[PDB]
Amino acid sequence: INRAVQLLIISYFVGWVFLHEKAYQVRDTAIESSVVTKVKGFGRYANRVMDVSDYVTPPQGTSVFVIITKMIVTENQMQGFCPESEEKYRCVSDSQCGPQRFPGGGILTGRCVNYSSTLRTCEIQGWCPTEVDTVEMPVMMEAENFTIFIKNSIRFPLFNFEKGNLLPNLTAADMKTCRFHPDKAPFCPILRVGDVVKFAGQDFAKLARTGGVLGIKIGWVCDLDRAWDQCIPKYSFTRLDGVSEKSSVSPGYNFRFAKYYKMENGSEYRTLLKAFGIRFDVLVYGNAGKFNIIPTIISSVAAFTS
Amino acid sequence: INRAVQLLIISYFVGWVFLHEKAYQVRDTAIESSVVTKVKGFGRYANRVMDVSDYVTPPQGTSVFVIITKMIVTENQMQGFCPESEEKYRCVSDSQCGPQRFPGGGILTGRCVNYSSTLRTCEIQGWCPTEVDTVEMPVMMEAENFTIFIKNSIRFPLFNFEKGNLLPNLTAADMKTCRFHPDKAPFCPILRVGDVVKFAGQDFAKLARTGGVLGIKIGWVCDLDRAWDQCIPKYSFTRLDGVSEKSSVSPGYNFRFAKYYKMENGSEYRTLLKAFGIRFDVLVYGNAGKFNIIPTIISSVAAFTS
Amino acid sequence: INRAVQLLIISYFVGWVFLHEKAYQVRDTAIESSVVTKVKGFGRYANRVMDVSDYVTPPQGTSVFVIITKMIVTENQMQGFCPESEEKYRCVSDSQCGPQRFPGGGILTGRCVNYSSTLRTCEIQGWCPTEVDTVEMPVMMEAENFTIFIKNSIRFPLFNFEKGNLLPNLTAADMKTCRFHPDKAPFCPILRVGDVVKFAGQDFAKLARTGGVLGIKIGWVCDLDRAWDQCIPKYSFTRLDGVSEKSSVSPGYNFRFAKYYKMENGSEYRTLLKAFGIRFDVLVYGNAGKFNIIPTIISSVAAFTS
Ligand SMILES: Nc1ncnc2c1ncn2[C@@H]1O[C@H](COP(=O)(O)OP(=O)(O)OP(=O)(O)O)[C@@H](O)[C@H]1O
Ligand SMILES: Nc1ncnc2c1ncn2[C@@H]1O[C@H](COP(=O)(O)OP(=O)(O)OP(=O)(O)O)[C@@H](O)[C@H]1O
Ligand SMILES: Nc1ncnc2c1ncn2[C@@H]1O[C@H](COP(=O)(O)OP(=O)(O)OP(=O)(O)O)[C@@H](O)[C@H]1O
Ligand SMILES: *[C@@H]1O[C@H](CO)[C@@H](O[C@@H]2O[C@H](CO)[C@@H](O)[C@H](O)[C@H]2NC(C)=O)[C@H](O)[C@H]1NC(C)=O
Ligand SMILES: *[C@@H]1O[C@H](CO)[C@@H](O[C@@H]2O[C@H](CO)[C@@H](O)[C@H](O)[C@H]2NC(C)=O)[C@H](O)[C@H]1NC(C)=O
Ligand SMILES: *[C@@H]1O[C@H](CO)[C@@H](O[C@@H]2O[C@H](CO)[C@@H](O)[C@H](O)[C@H]2NC(C)=O)[C@H](O)[C@H]1NC(C)=O
Ligand SMILES: *[C@@H]1O[C@H](CO)[C@@H](O[C@@H]2O[C@H](CO)[C@@H](O)[C@H](O)[C@H]2NC(C)=O)[C@H](O)[C@H]1NC(C)=O
Ligand SMILES: *[C@@H]1O[C@H](CO)[C@@H](O[C@@H]2O[C@H](CO)[C@@H](O)[C@H](O)[C@H]2NC(C)=O)[C@H](O)[C@H]1NC(C)=O
Ligand SMILES: *[C@@H]1O[C@H](CO)[C@@H](O[C@@H]2O[C@H](CO)[C@@H](O)[C@H](O)[C@H]2NC(C)=O)[C@H](O)[C@H]1NC(C)=O
Ligand SMILES: *[C@@H]1O[C@H](CO)[C@@H](O)[C@H](O)[C@H]1NC(C)=O
Ligand SMILES: *[C@@H]1O[C@H](CO)[C@@H](O)[C@H](O)[C@H]1NC(C)=O
Ligand SMILES: *[C@@H]1O[C@H](CO)[C@@H](O)[C@H](O)[C@H]1NC(C)=O
Ligand SMILES: [Mg+2]
Ligand SMILES: [Mg+2]
Ligand SMILES: [Mg+2]
């Protein structure tokens, strides 16, 4: 019957396509973005204090940056023939010392030598002090702090539009003692690591003890057709590895690096750091709509079809 | 009236959809890209000369790489109880020295000690020589130079297509003394930093003195349906942070890193570098069109609807 | 004739749009991904042995990481006035020594001095031992090994869906001696570098001797409408620079970095490493489909038009 058809013709276009879907909908997916991240704060580890240039492994301050929370340090690693402390590689003869396994110290030379007094392991060639990743080192519990400053600037090239999250209404006096809280200061770009993990929804102790990646997505669903001040950034913080993390193997994200030094000598040595950190990832996504000319007649024709 | 309808039926399809819009329009957004960037040149700073392995902080040579233009260097930073040179933290008693503020040197121990002769500041624990970011250090004015070599290779998997910006027509003799200028050599992949900032549209002195990110987009709007040599890369250089830069706080992009050394001793020390640089970002985007079979009948049906 | 039209109405919708194209097709392009890469293995170079913290230049273990295969090492590089070993810069007088060329050692001072006994080259200012990139250093032929562990976790936010490539069915005992082979273990996330280059389709010797980038794409074409275990990752390994590589200039991807040390002195020195490596790139792409409500009536209307 055409009686219901007459109503349903406008119940879908005007109700949803026009008023809700913004029937014009001139989009621009290609948004060019720039993110600058700066970590600030001071932490205590073992018996010393470290700053931004210490727990932040990548100094670029790009959208990807690791905040180290747990360290395993091995100092004065010189090269030579050395045994290992891995109890999973017990040998009593050289026969079970040839190349058939996956050593963690170095290439086996087919020699089972004593380690300290009675522990016999295959002799390896490489850095002598083998790292011990079976000791629960104290976590940098001061890592609820160290604020993060995120400067984001985006451009829509087709619309020529340009906007940054550092609006002129914010001064240095405000930024001196500014936090992030999306009920009273949605706009302040000074995040807190503890606040970030709280918004993610996990306790900070476990994440700092095991490591992970927390993605901070800045969505810009703007309304350029309306006033330009209505395009408001939206911050969403979500764990990324935690989906595949649960309780299976590889219970976190950890990496290994080293610092290389040299005596007044002909030989070098490195200090090895195995770091469990919280690698922050910054992602920028969004779109803008404009009234334009072309989609109006297209939508009119589409309504004519109905 | 059908008289105007007959004309308007083909005025929109043949005029725009067919001839201009390439009605077939078989697209492939998923283009796999590889960018290799190599900076070359030698610069003078203070009283010494540095090369590519010095001002280019990330040695990967990926699409993201910082060209350092200004340095603030603090040498022989040993750990201990030290004061700070920040005049914004004046104290006359220990009462205003407990933890309630945002120190830039280290964790305050609640002790206000003299700095040099009469300047009293809260005693901090950490690296002793505090950095001074209030001195206008000379800018590396030689940074108009240091050419950049960009090797870009892309593949369209659905179309199997493959192309790189290093065409076989270019030899080493040409690349020896080749610049970039999109009127006589659009194709030479040897950019100049001064040329890049000039095409961006800002004076190099201000950018090198404050820092920023300059995105270089390589657009490949190819015409695979036609001859394969007509797919020509287009280079567009645009500032990214400059949108949110203007004259507000945080007037540039700067980072901090350090180099760690160790004496014939039991103690370590680091040299801290606060760098204001021009971080070049390389982005690859584009699409390809093919005649194919499917869209032809779809467009024919769409024309039949009109 | 309507006789063939009646058949062709359903020959295109039911045959292709409905059964094959999954007419509902509720997509989600915005998939949030996290990739953690860990290289393991030990290699022999010159007369020493190196581990993960040595040939893997970026210790972040992100989607982009270089596996160094060939090194050119210059040790004890101190600053001063030094000549160069580049035979392409022969001079017999100071007149052809002013600034008009592209030096590889440093800024020319307009002085042509002897190099060793009879070779005269322009005197440069900078690091004294100039690197020699014209000697075929032995390739790390042990680079067929050093397995790679890739942990990938993805989330579809609109569908709330969440999945990682480290499924609970895999334990540590399996991962201890697990390889990657897409006929018997498609699911094991332990790739082999030799296996990766074999699947790419090039001999490993040439790639390790010249360098390149090998992209590993993990496609997730899931069927969330069906059981969630049917969404199976697909690994595709493809060379990226090899398209623009062929036999033209710049026959590979190489970079330069250095390690900085300091004596018990007032001067510093660096050891320079020119590295030809295989930079692995990890890309994540995919989409998911859901039955939903909206597209059903849209497809019904589209069929009504026919
Ligand atoms: N390339 C690889 N080849 C084989 N096993 C690997 C590889 N990378 C990681 N693994 C294994 O994955 C598991 C997770 O290790 P993870 O990276 O979380 O750190 P870990 O348990 O401290 O071990 P590791 O000492 O091996 O670094 C371990 O059982 C480890 O042996
Ligand atoms: N994590 C942070 N917490 C608080 N304030 C911050 C943070 N990061 C940056 N700021 C502030 O942002 C402003 C811009 O500083 P910027 O990074 O441009 O370098 P700067 O002015 O030399 O300062 P700084 O010595 O703090 O590095 C400063 O007022 C600084 O205090
Ligand atoms: N910024 C640049 N300006 C000029 N020529 C460059 C630049 N970058 C690379 N080239 C040239 O590109 C070619 C490829 O060099 P490539 O990077 O593959 O290493 P190479 O041949 O060992 O040379 P190099 O000693 O210059 O690093 C060389 O002829 C080199 O001179
Ligand atoms: C991290 O910073 C917070 C504040 O930003 C510290 O927490 C406060 O410390 C003061 C110290 O006197 C207490 O009075 C407050 O009750 C604490 N909580 C709050 C909400 O203010 C905290 O000590 C810092 N360090 C760590 C490890 O959390
Ligand atoms: C400067 O302008 C900005 C943008 O409007 C203000 O920031 C937000 O403004 C909205 C107004 O719709 C308020 O609801 C928010 O509470 C504001 N957030 C923050 C963090 O301020 C900002 O308040 C303005 N500054 C002023 C008025 O001093
Ligand atoms: C950067 O390189 C340019 C050339 O590539 C140098 O500029 C020229 O220097 C010569 C020196 O005799 C002058 O004769 C020219 O007039 C200069 N300009 C041009 C356009 O050739 C420049 O000196 C280098 N350094 C800096 C800091 O710009
Ligand atoms: C090698 O072929 C390339 C691709 O055509 C040439 O590069 C451009 O060719 C177009 C022809 O349409 C010219 O208009 C441009 O001026 C060329 N640019 C450059 C930088 O050369 C290139 O010229 C060819 N090399 C030759 C003929 O020696
Ligand atoms: C890389 O590892 C492979 C095995 O993963 C080594 O190849 C085997 O070495 C044993 C040594 O006794 C031989 O018996 C086998 O025939 C070799 N091949 C295979 C397929 O097992 C190889 O030696 C290692 N190193 C290099 C440089 O390839
Ligand atoms: C655990 O479940 C996974 C997911 O099904 C199994 O992995 C694959 O399962 C498919 C079943 O369709 C097999 O065809 C593949 O051969 C399996 N691949 C691998 C590497 O195992 C896995 O087998 C299961 N583990 C068990 C049953 O122990
Ligand atoms: C380094 O110094 C030690 C003594 O501290 C010495 O035994 C060793 O031989 C030196 N290394 C080299 C390469 O000479
Ligand atoms: C480092 O050397 C200095 C003397 O130059 C000495 O005072 C200091 O105690 C040494 N550090 C350690 C940890 O022994
Ligand atoms: C470094 O030590 C050498 C001797 O090994 C000396 O000639 C030189 O002057 C020292 N450098 C400085 C800056 O004193
Ligand atoms: Mg382990
Ligand atoms: Mg400051
Ligand atoms: Mg060369």
Q: Contact, A291 vs A299, CB < 8 A?
A: no
Assign B287 to helix, strand or coil: strand
Assign A302 to helix, strand or coil: helix
Of all protein residues, the one whose alpha carbon is nearest to atom 23 of ligand 5 is A169
Sequence-ordered list of residues with C-beta below 8 angstroms from that of A149, at least 6 positions apart, any chain: A37, A38, A39, A40, A189, A190, B250
Establish if B56 touches chain A: CB-CB under 8 angstroms: no
Q: Is the CB of C141 under 6 A from ligand 8?
A: yes
CA distance B135 to A98: 62
Q: Which of C135, C192, C132, C143 is nearest to C45 (CA)?
A: C143
The DSSP symbol for B22 reads: T
Determine whether the interchain pair A163/B244 forms a contact, defined as Cβ–Cβ distance below 8 Å.
yes
CA distance A146 to A277: 14
The DSSP symbol for A54 reads: H
What does this entry list as its resolution, in Å? 3.6
Q: Which ligand minimizes its atom distance to the CA of B80?
A: 11
* Contact residues on chain A for C169, CB-CB shorter than 8 A: none
Could you tell me the strand order of the sheet in which B79-82 lies? B79-82, B120-127, B107-114
Closest approach atom of ligand 8 to CA C141: 27
Kindly state the tokens that stand for A220.
Answer: 């810009």
Assign A217 to helix, strand or coil: strand
Of all protein residues, the one whose alpha carbon is nearest to atom 21 of ligand 1 is A250
Q: Which of C70, C20, C5, C52 is nearest to C256 (CA)?
A: C70
Q: Contact, B33 vs B153, CB < 8 A?
A: yes
CA distance C257 to C270: 10
Assign A244 to helix, strand or coil: coil
User: H/E element holding A143?
Assistant: none
Residue A271 counted as an annotated binding residue: no
CA distance A198 to A200: 5
Give the residue numbers of the binding site of B for Mg(2+): 133
Q: Contact, C84 vs C113, CB < 8 A?
A: no
CA distance C214 to C283: 11
Q: Is the CB of A59 under 6 A from ligand 10?
A: no
Kindly state the tokens that stand for A7.
Answer: 């109503």
Establish if B238 touches chain A: CB-CB under 8 angstroms: yes
Closest approach atom of ligand 8 to CA C145: 1
CA-nearest residue to A282 within chain C is: C32
Q: Contact, A143 vs A208, CB < 8 A?
A: yes
Ion ligand 13: protein residues whose beta carbon lies under 5 Å: A 133
Establish if C217 touches chain B: CB-CB under 8 angstroms: yes
Q: Which of A242, A226, A222 is nearest to A284 (CA)?
A: A222
Q: Is the CB of A265 under 6 A from ligand 10?
A: yes
CA distance B196 to B205: 13
User: H/E element holding B217?
Assistant: strand B212-221
Q: Contact, C92 vs C120, CB < 8 A?
A: yes
Establish if B221 touches chain A: CB-CB under 8 angstroms: no
Determine whether the interchain pair A153/B241 forms a contact, defined as Cβ–Cβ distance below 8 Å.
yes
Sequence-ordered list of residues with C-beta below 8 angstroms from that of B82, at least 6 positions apart, any chain: B105, B106, B123, B124, B125, B126, B127, B128, B129, B130
Q: Contact, C36 vs A241, CB < 8 A?
A: yes
Give bridge partners of residue A44 from the DSSP assignment.
A49
* Contact residues on chain A for B237, CB-CB shorter than 8 A: none
CA distance A231 to A223: 6
Longest dimension (CA), chain B: 97
Q: Contact, B290 vs B225, CB < 8 A?
A: yes
- Number of neighbouring beta carbons within 10 Å of residue A131: 19
Q: How many residues can be counted in chain A?
A: 306
Q: Is the CB of A144 under 6 A from ligand 4?
A: yes
Assign B268 to helix, strand or coil: strand
Sequence-ordered list of residues with C-beta below 8 angstroms from that of A148, at least 6 positions apart, any chain: A37, A38, A39, A40, A190, A191, A192, A193, A196, A280
CA distance A156 to C82: 51
Q: Contact, B230 vs B222, CB < 8 A?
A: yes
User: H/E element holding A52?
Assistant: helix A52-55
CA-nearest residue to B35 within chain C is: C241
CA distance C66 to C72: 16
| C292 Cα to the center of ligand 10, angstroms | 72
- Number of neighbouring beta carbons within 10 Å of residue B240: 27
Residues C202-218 as b or e (16 or more Cβ within 10 Å = b): eebeebbbbbbbbbbbb
The DSSP symbol for B141 reads: G
Fold of A1-26+292-306: Helix Hairpins (1.10.287)
Q: Contact, A139 vs A97, CB < 8 A?
A: no
Which residues in A189-299 belong to E strands, given as ranges?
190-191, 212-221, 234-239, 254-262, 268-287
Sequence-ordered list of residues with C-beta below 8 angstroms from that of A251, at least 6 positions apart, any chain: A210, A245
Which residues in B40-191 belong to E strands, given as ranges?
43-45, 48-50, 64-77, 79-82, 107-114, 120-127, 148-155, 162-164, 190-191
Q: How many residues can be counted in chain B?
A: 306
Distance (Å) from the alpha carbon of B243 to chain C's nearest alpha carbon: 26
CATH entry 2.60.490.10 includes domain B28-78+128-290: yes
Of B58, B217, B243, the CB nearest to A163: B243
CA distance B219 to C242: 20
Q: Is the CB of B185 under 6 A from ligand 7?
A: yes
Assign B257 to helix, strand or coil: strand
Strands A120-127 and A79-82: what pairing?
antiparallel
* Contact residues on chain A for C263, CB-CB shorter than 8 A: 264
Domain ranges of chain A: 1-26+292-306, 27-77+136-290, 79-127
Look at phi and psi of residue C43 and say left if phi exceeds 0, alpha if psi is from -120 to 50, else beta.
beta
| B121 Cα to the center of ligand 4, angstroms | 23
CA distance B55 to B39: 10
Selected residue of B9, B243, B265, B304 to mutate for chain A interface (largest A Cβ count, 10 A):
B243
- Number of neighbouring beta carbons within 10 Å of residue B90: 12
Q: Is the CB of C101 under 6 A from ligand 3?
A: no
* Contact residues on chain B for C109, CB-CB shorter than 8 A: none
Cα B291 to Cα B18, B159, B174, B224, distances in angstroms: 12, 11, 37, 9
- Number of neighbouring beta carbons within 10 Å of residue C195: 18
Establish if C285 touches chain B: CB-CB under 8 angstroms: yes
CA distance B51 to B40: 8
CA distance B43 to B30: 40
| A219 Cα to the center of ligand 7, angstroms | 43
Kindly state the tokens that stand for C5.
Answer: 């039209």
Determine whether the interchain pair C151/A261 forms a contact, defined as Cβ–Cβ distance below 8 Å.
no
CA distance A222 to B13: 32
Identify the sign of the CA torsion C156, C162, C167, C172. positive
Give the residue numbers of the binding site of C for ATP: 38-40, 147, 250, 254-256, 274
Amino acid at C166: L
Determine whether the interchain pair A240/C53 forms a contact, defined as Cβ–Cβ distance below 8 Å.
no
CA-nearest residue to C258 within chain A is: A260
Establish if C218 touches chain B: CB-CB under 8 angstroms: no
Kindly state the tokens that stand for A184.
Answer: 């009273």
Assign A123 to helix, strand or coil: strand
Amino acid at B141: M
CA distance A143 to A131: 24
DSSP symbols for A185-211: BSS--EE-HHHHHHHHTS-HHHHHHH-
Q: Contact, B107 vs A42, CB < 8 A?
A: yes
* Contact residues on chain A for C170, CB-CB shorter than 8 A: 248-249
CA distance A94 to A113: 9
Q: Which of C72, C103, C108, C107 is nearest to C88 (CA)?
A: C103
Residue A246 counted as an annotated binding residue: no
Q: Ligand 10 test: best mutation among A264, A267, A269, most atoms within 8 Å of CB?
A: A267
CA-nearest residue to A80 within chain C is: C48
Strands C162-164 and C43-45: what pairing?
unpaired
Q: Contact, A178 vs A188, CB < 8 A?
A: yes
Kindly state the tokens that stand for C130.
Answer: 């100039």
| A78 Cα to the center of ligand 13, angstroms | 21
Q: Which of C51, C179, C151, C46 is nearest to A104 (CA)?
A: C51
The DSSP symbol for A65 reads: E
Q: Which of C229, C232, C226 is nearest to C289 (CA)?
A: C226
Q: Which of C143, C272, C264, C280 is nearest to C213 (CA)?
A: C280
CA distance B294 to C16: 11
Amino acid at A272: L
Question: CA angle, corner C144, sides to A249 and C197, nearest 5?
Answer: 90
Give bridge partners of residue A34 from the DSSP assignment.
A153
Sequence-ordered list of residues with C-beta below 8 angstroms from that of C61, at least 6 positions apart, any chain: A253, A255, C36, C37, C38, C39
Residues with CB under 6 A from ligand 12: C 263, 265-267
Give the side-chain half-sphere CA count within 13 A for B242: 19
Determine whether the interchain pair C249/B171 forms a contact, defined as Cβ–Cβ distance below 8 Å.
yes
Of C49, C163, C166, the CB nearest to A107: C49
How many helices (H) does chain B have, and how many strands (E)?
Answer: 6, 14
Q: 3-state SS of chain C?
A: CHHHHHHHHHHHHHHHHHCCCCCCCCCCCCCEEEEEEEECCCEEECCEEECHHHHECCCCCCCEEEEEEEEEEEEEECEEEECCCCHHHECCCHHHHCCCCCCCCCEEEEEEEECCCCCEEEEEEEECCCCCCCCCCCCCHHHHCCCEEEEEEEECCCCCCEEECCCCCCCHHHHHCCCCECCCECCCCEECHHHHHHHHCCCHHHHHHHCEEEEEEEEEECCCCCCHHHCCCEEEEEECHHHCCCCCCCCCCEEEEEEEEECCCCCEEEEEEEEEEEEEEEEEEEECCCCCCHHHHHHHHHHHHC
Q: Which CATH architecture has domain A27-77+136-290?
A: Sandwich (2.60)
Of all protein residues, the one whose alpha carbon is nearest to atom 2 of ligand 12 is C265
Exposed/middle/buried for B34, CB within 10 Å: 0-12, 13-18, 19+? buried
Which residues in B4-119 belong to E strands, given as ranges?
32-39, 43-45, 48-50, 64-77, 79-82, 107-114
CA distance B279 to B242: 13
CATH of C28-77+141-290, one of 3.40.50.1220, 2.60.490.10, 3.40.1260.10, 3.40.190.80: 2.60.490.10
Give contacts of A 123-182 with C, CB under 8 A.
Answer: 125-127
Q: Is the CB of B49 under 6 A from ligand 7?
A: no
- Cα A231 to chain centroid distance, Å, stands at 26
Q: Contact, A147 vs A191, CB < 8 A?
A: yes
Q: Is the CB of B264 under 6 A from ligand 11?
A: no
Strands B212-221 and B268-287: what pairing?
parallel
Strands B48-50 and B43-45: what pairing?
antiparallel
Exposed/middle/buried for A208, CB within 10 Å: 0-12, 13-18, 19+? buried
Kindly state the tokens that stand for B283.
Answer: 């982005």
Amino acid at B179: R
* Contact residues on chain B for C215, CB-CB shorter than 8 A: 32, 34
CATH class of C1-26+291-306: mainly alpha
Q: 3-state SS of B155-196?
A: ECCCCCCEEECCCCCCCHHHHHCCCCECCCECCCCEECHHHH
Of A126, A253, A258, the CB nearest to C36: A253
| B236 Cα to the center of ligand 6, angstroms | 25
- Cα C60 to chain centroid distance, Å, stands at 14
Q: Which of B206, B178, B198, B195 is nearest to B69 (CA)?
A: B206
CA distance A271 to A263: 13
Alpha helices in A161-276, H assignment, sequence order: 172-176, 193-200, 204-210
Q: Is the CB of A142 under 6 A from ligand 4?
A: yes
How many helices (H) does chain A have, and how many strands (E)?
Answer: 6, 14
Amino acid at A224: L
CA distance A110 to A106: 12
Determine whether the interchain pair A177/B102 forms a contact, defined as Cβ–Cβ distance below 8 Å.
yes
CA distance B57 to B273: 11
